[PDB]
């Protein structure tokens, strides 16, 4: 109740933009030269959105091991997160590489691939059974097994091959399609349905690699995956659930990846969902 008693403080004296500014000013700042070096240009989608050397996902390639993604791991929720931008046309087969060498066995996507006609991410699963995708530059192949098709989100069966030795894996591909173009949902339901579902799955098992999260530059919509999915796991674990107090678990988070939540809606749309989740 005390997060919502704050929620309706926040909201009737139009506080948002205050407290989201402050968490801006507090976040930690360290180095991106990775990112950075001109080889790597062309592997970012943002100029202003690196990830962090010290927690950086490596690729094991000898060439370049650089992706844009960052490993969030949530020592108190004992849940890690891999927070990424969406691929470019030509960062596929790192993306793929990268889920194969993590052992991961979901991936969340928040946005459409074009919105409001900017390309925010590249296609980089299958759309059809029958044309199933090689990345030749990561020896990768992709299928489309199956797919159920829901009014908010869709839930693919994608089937990964390691092309070199032929070993494949099942990856569950949880897709929510119908974030709004500009700004956040009037509601969480359909948010924390979809939040419900990837947990259910058994991606997010320690027993498999971390998820992989993404939606254009992997900080706002991701960012607001990641922060409600760990506050309502912190609620479950902890004794006092009052106790989680989501702008300290915002400020942990963005020690491992800058800029989280980039707006003051999206914060209130986390404390939205993470209130109704609450009570489920
Ligand atoms: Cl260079
Ligand atoms: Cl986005
Ligand atoms: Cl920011």
């Given at each position: 109740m005390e997060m919502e008693k704050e929620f309706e403080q926040i909201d009737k004296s139009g506080s948002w933009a205050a407290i989201y500014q402050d968490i801006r000013h507090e976040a930690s700042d360290f180095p991106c030269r990775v990112a950075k070096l001109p080889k790597n240009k062309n592997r970012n989608?943002?100029?202003?959105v690196s990830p962090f050397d010290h927690s950086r996902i490596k690729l094991h390639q000898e060439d370049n091991d650089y992706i844009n993604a960052s490993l969030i791991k949530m020592e108190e929720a004992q849940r890690s997160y891999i927070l990424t931008q969406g691929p470019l046309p030509n960062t596929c087969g790192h993306f793929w590489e990268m889920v194969w060498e993590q052992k991961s066995r979901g991936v969340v996507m928040l946005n459409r691939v074009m919105e409001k006609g900017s390309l925010?991410?590249?296609?980089?699963?299958?759309?059809?059974?029958?044309?199933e995708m090689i990345f030749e530059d990561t020896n990768l192949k992709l299928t489309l097994i199956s797919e159920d098709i829901k009014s908010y989100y869709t839930v693919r069966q994608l089937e990964l091959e390691?092309?070199?030795?032929?070993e494949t894996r099942e990856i569950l591909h949880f897709h929510?399609?119908?974030?709004?173009?500009?700004?956040?949902?009037?509601?969480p339901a359909s948010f924390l349905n979809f939040l419900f579902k990837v947990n259910e799955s058994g991606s997010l098992s320690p027993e498999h690699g971390p998820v992989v999260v993404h939606c254009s530059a992997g900080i706002g919509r991701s960012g607001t995956y990641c922060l409600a999915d760990t506050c309502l796991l912190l609620m479950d674990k902890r004794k006092d659930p009052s106790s989680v107090d989501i702008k300290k678990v915002l400020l942990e988070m963005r020690k491992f990846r800058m800029?989280?939540?980039?707006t003051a809606d999206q914060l209130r749309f986390s404390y939205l969902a993470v209130i109704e989740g609450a009570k489920f």
């Open positions: 989608r943002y100029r202003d925010k991410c590249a296609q980089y699963w299958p759309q059809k059974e029958e044309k390691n092309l070199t030795t032929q929510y399609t119908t974030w709004p173009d500009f700004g956040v949902p009037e509601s800029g989280l939540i980039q």
